[PDB]
């Protein structure tokens, strides 16, 4: 049997190796790549459908209320007003982060919030516009599980304002594309992301670095530039690439869609893109947005990933599974 | 927005101005800092 | 109704509950 | 071992069909090579 | 030795080799985040809301 | 004033 | 690069780690 | 990546409780 086991192992090894060579040769043609992608899309069609997450109950509900109030207020606010609101809210968030004593008193749970409103108004009623102060008082009125959730809600409202002005201009697609490109480049260079994520370094210096190095280029969307500058400035021990990924995810989620970091071997034909979007939307219920990565080792197929679920169709993964099946 | 020493005064005023709730411990009752459901 | 959070802590609607924050003592079931 | 070495070559000729079938099945489409 | 059976073993193995992609849930070692509906680790090595370095972890289901 | 501890105007300068 | 620095513990760039937060003053490691 | 490297080196050079030279918080 030991001779039999050795014979099986060796024969399987040779067969799998030369089969891998055969696959590498056959898929090398772009038409073969497209055929594999189409087969995977058909399989996904055959596949059956499915069946603010770091926030506690009180903070979840309070942020929901603040977001709804912002949507109510900003429905009639214009692009310049939106930019002013976003800048003001970013400034207020920086103020809270710097002045911890003020933050704790503004974010302490209470049954009557009148003292909070009095503090806010007697503090900065005139320094900021009416909409900014209205949102701030709505935010402090509610109950936050942790005092940090207050700053989170403030920066979230500011981000929503910037995404709203993006919508008003019409560059939602372009701003989301810029955000995802920025996230990819930050991921590819962990050293820069580590440098920017350090809050202990002055925030303004980091904003200047991002402007002069990455965000300042002829082909950078203004909204994406401002939004990343805001996020990097108001950073609290959060890795920069994670922050920009959250930015892009929120930007898409405003439209009800979801990020699908599809990775392919080559750019998908527009018909393939529509097919993929449709199939993924029907699988996961709500519509989705497809973001393409290109990696030669995939040898065709698609390695889809949404949230926490991965559908690994790469031919390389299939080959590896073949090489792990030999007795 | 500008941070100025006046805010250090403002907080004091707030503290001067300020029924309990069973958090799990009771919050409120100003008359540790966090606490002494529903 | 409530859902499991930790494994056993159970989150519940605000007024239909005791660790506080509506909690008591597979995820999201 | 001697018979093992013998069977090495005795079966190395026909590994080609096994490997072609493996590649075709992972691709799902028959491979001529 | 009946080499026919030795060849036939791998013939059976390769045939009916269905590695059809299956929707799977993965997490990442954090010091294991993810796996909301919860495990294999690379090399065959085999619980609160926040978590259950950086390597991918697959649940055996 | 007293919080827990005594808080004095300016760890970090440390009811009512 | 892939060169860590002393924090307390050594902090390495993400992906280059040989404690979470990519950990395992400021002198290269 | 030439521009980004130049800019980052410029910034870090310019940049170069307290007593940086034991944790990111204090000694």
Q: Do G19 and E30 touch (CB under 8 A)?
A: no
Whether A6 and D7 have beta carbons less than 8 Å apart is answered as: no
Please indicate whether, in this complex, the C-beta atoms of A15 and D1 are within 8 angstroms of each other: no
Q: Do chains G and D touch (3 or more CB pairs under 8 A)?
A: no
* Nearest-Cα residue of chain A relative to residue G14: A190
Nearest-CA neighbor of G9 among E31, H12, A241?
E31
Give the dihedral of Cα atoms A108, A109, A112, A113; nearest 10 deg. 50
Q: What stretch of H or E contains F15?
A: none
Q: Identify the CATH number of the domain in which residue E26 sits.
A: 2.40.30.20
**How does strand E24-28 pair with strand C9-11?**
unpaired
For D24, residues 6+ apart whose C-beta sits below 8 A from its C-beta are D30, D31
Which alpha helices (DSSP H) does A144-269 contain, by range? 147-169, 172-188, 190-197, 203-210, 222-233, 240-253
**Domains contained in chain E, number:** 1
Cα distances (angstroms) measured from residue B28 to each of B15, C18, C21, F4: 13, 18, 16, 14
Q: Are strands B26-27 and G10-11 parallel, antiparallel or unpaired?
A: unpaired
Domain check: are A164 and A68 in the same one?
yes
**Cα angle: A72, vertex A73, A78; to 5 degrees:** 120
Q: β-strands A309-312, A289-294: how paired? A: unpaired
Q: What is the 3-state secondary structure (H, E, C) of A205-238?
A: HHHHHHHHHHHCCCCCCHHHHHHHHHHHHCCCCC
The two three-digit tokens of residue A53, written as one number:
């997450």
Select from A54, A48, A42, A53 the least CA-distant residue to A284: A48
Do A236 and A314 lie in a common domain?
Answer: no
What distances in angstroms separate CA A220 from CA A11, A165, A182, A252, E13, one per listed residue? 56, 16, 10, 18, 53
A243 and A294 share one domain: no
Cβ of A110 within 8 Å of Cβ of B18? The answer is yes
Domain range holding A111?
Answer: 53-169
- Most G CBs within 10 A among A186, A187, A190, A196, hence the mutation to make, goes to A190
**Residue A290, SS3?**
strand
> Is the four-CA dihedral C19, C22, C25, C26 of positive or negative sign?
negative
A60 and A165 share one domain:
yes
Does A102 lie in the same domain as A208? Answer: no
Nearest CA in chain F to B29: F15
- Number of CB atoms found within 10 A of residue A35's CB: 17
Find the discontinuities in chain H where C to next N exceeds 2.5 angstroms and give the residue preceding each: 16, 21
Domains in chain A, number? 3
Same domain, A280 and A208: no
Determine G/F contact with 3+ CB pairs under 8 A as the test: no
| Cα(E40)–Cα(E61) distance, integer angstroms | 10
Q: Answer yes or no: do A249 and A276 share one domain.
A: no
Dihedral sign (CA A125, A129, A130, A136)? negative
Residues A41 and A28: their CA atoms lie apart, in Å, by 19
Domain range for E30 is: 5-61
**Residue A183 within any structural domain of the chain:** no
Bridge partners (DSSP) of residue C6 are C9
Q: Entry resolution in angstroms? A: 3.7
The answer to whether the Cβ–Cβ distance between A61 and C23 falls below 8 Å is no
Domain contains A174: no
Which residues in C6-25 are b (16+ Cβ under 10 Å) and which e? eeeebbeeeeeeeebbbbbe
Q: Nearest-CA neighbor of A100 among F10, G22, D22, G15? A: F10
Contact yes or no for C21/A56 (Cβ under 8 A): yes
Neighbours of H20 (CB within 10 A): 8
Place of tokens 């990546």: H1
**Cα dist from A133 to A79, A85, A98, A136, whole Å:** 18, 10, 19, 5
User: How many angstroms separate the CA atoms of A236 and C5, rounded?
Assistant: 26
Distance from CA of G27 to the nearest CA of H (A): 9
Q: Which chains reach chain F with 3 or more Cβ–Cβ distances below 8 angstroms?
A: B
The verdict on A144 and A65 lying in the same domain is yes
Distance (Å, rounded) from C-alpha E44 to C-alpha A324? 11
Q: Is A176 within the bounds of a domain? A: no
Residues in E touching C6 (Cβ below 8 Å):
47-49
Q: Is A237 left (phi over 0), alpha (psi -120 to 50) or beta?
A: left
Residue that is last in its domain, among A200, A231, A255: A255
Cα–Cα dist H27/C18, whole Å:
39
Distance in angstroms (rounded) separating the CA atoms of residues A237 and A192: 15
| Strand G10-11 with E56-58, pairing | unpaired
Annotate C1-29 with DSSP letters as a single string. --EEEE--EEE--TT----BTTBB-----
User: How many Å apart are CA A232 and CA A210, to the nearest integer?
Assistant: 8
Q: Give the technique used to solve this structure.
A: cryo-EM
Residue A288 lies in a domain: yes
Beta strands A259-264 and A289-294: pairing type? parallel
Distances (CA, A) of A89 to A135, A179, C4, D31: 9, 21, 36, 62
Distance CA A324, CA F15 (A): 67
- Which residues is G11 bridged to in the sheet? G5, G23
Q: Cα(A197)–Cα(A235) distance, rounded to whole angstroms?
A: 7
For residue H20, give the 3-state DSSP assignment: coil
Decide: D26 and A318 in contact? Cβ < 8 Å: yes
Q: How many CB atoms are closer than 10 A to CB B4? A: 8
Across the interface, whether the CB atoms of E37 and C27 are under 8 A apart is answered yes
Residue A21 lies in a domain: no
Residue A58 falls inside a structural domain: yes
Residues A155 and A63 in one domain: yes
Same domain, yes or no: A251 and A264: no
Give the end of a domain, one of A202, A226, A255. A255
Q: Point out the residue among D7, D21, D25 whose CB comes nearest to the CB of E1.
A: D7
Residues A149 and A96 occupy one common structural domain:
yes
Contacts B28 to F, Cβ<8 Å: none
D22 to chain E, closest Cα gap in Å: 5
Q: State residue A66 phi and psi, 5-degree precision.
A: -65, -40
**Are residues A107 and A87 part of one domain?**
yes
E44: helix, strand or coil: coil
Neighbouring residues of A282: CB distance < 8 A, sequence distance ≥ 6 = A49
């Amino acid at each position: 049997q030991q001779l039999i086991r050795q014979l099986r192992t060796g024969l399987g090894a040779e067969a799998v190796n030369k089969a891998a060579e055969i696959v590498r040769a056959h898929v090398a043609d772009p038409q073969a790549q497209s055929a594999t992608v189409d087969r995977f899309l058909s399989e996904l069609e055959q596949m059956a459908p499915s069946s603010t997450s770091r926030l506690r109950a009180a903070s979840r509900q309070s942020l929901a209320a603040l977001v709804e109030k912002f949507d109510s207020v900003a429905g009639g606010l214009d692009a310049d007003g939106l930019t002013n609101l976003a800048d003001e809210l970013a400034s207020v968030a920086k103020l809270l982060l710097s002045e911890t004593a003020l933050n704790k008193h503004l974010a302490e749970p209470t049954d009557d919030s009148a003292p909070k409103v009095r503090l806010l108004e007697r503090l900065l009623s005139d320094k900021v516009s009416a909409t900014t102060l209205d949102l701030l008082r709505t935010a402090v009125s509610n109950r936050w599980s942790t005092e940090s959730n207050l700053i989170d809600a403030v920066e979230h409202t500011a981000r929503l304002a910037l995404l709203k002005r993006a919508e008003i201009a019409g560059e939602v697609d372009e701003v989301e594309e810029q955000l995802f490109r920025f996230g990819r480049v930050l991921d590819a260079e962990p050293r820069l992301s580590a440098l920017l994520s350090d809050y202990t370094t002055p925030a303004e210096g980091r904003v200047a670095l991002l402007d002069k190095a990455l965000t300042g280029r002829p082909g950078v969307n203004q909204t994406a530039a401002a939004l990343l500058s805001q996020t990097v400035g108001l950073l609290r021990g959060e890795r920069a690439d994670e922050a920009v990924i959250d930015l892009a995810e929120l930007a898409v989620s405003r439209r009800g869609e979801v990020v699908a970091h599809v990775s392919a071997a080559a750019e998908l034909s527009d018909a393939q893109r529509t097919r993929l979007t449709e199939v993924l939307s029907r699988i996961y219920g709500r519509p989705v947005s497809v973001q393409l990565h290109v990696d030669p080792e995939l040898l065709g197929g698609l390695s889809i990933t949404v949230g926490d679920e991965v559908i690994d169709g790469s031919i390389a993964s299939r080959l590896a599974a073949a090489q792990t099946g030999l007795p | 927005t500008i941070s100025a020493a006046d805010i250090e005064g403002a907080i004091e005023d707030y503290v001067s101005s300020f029924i309990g709730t069973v958090i799990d411990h009771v919050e409120g009752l100003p008359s540790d800092e966090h606490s002494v459901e529903g | 109704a409530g859902r499991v959070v930790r494994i056993v802590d159970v989150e519940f609607p605000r007024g239909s509950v005791h660790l506080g924050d509506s909690l008591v003592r597979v995820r999201g079931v | 071992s001697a018979q093992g070495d013998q069977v090495r070559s005795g079966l190395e000729s026909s590994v080609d069909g096994l490997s072609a079938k493996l590649a075709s099945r992972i691709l799902g489409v028959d491979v001529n090579s």
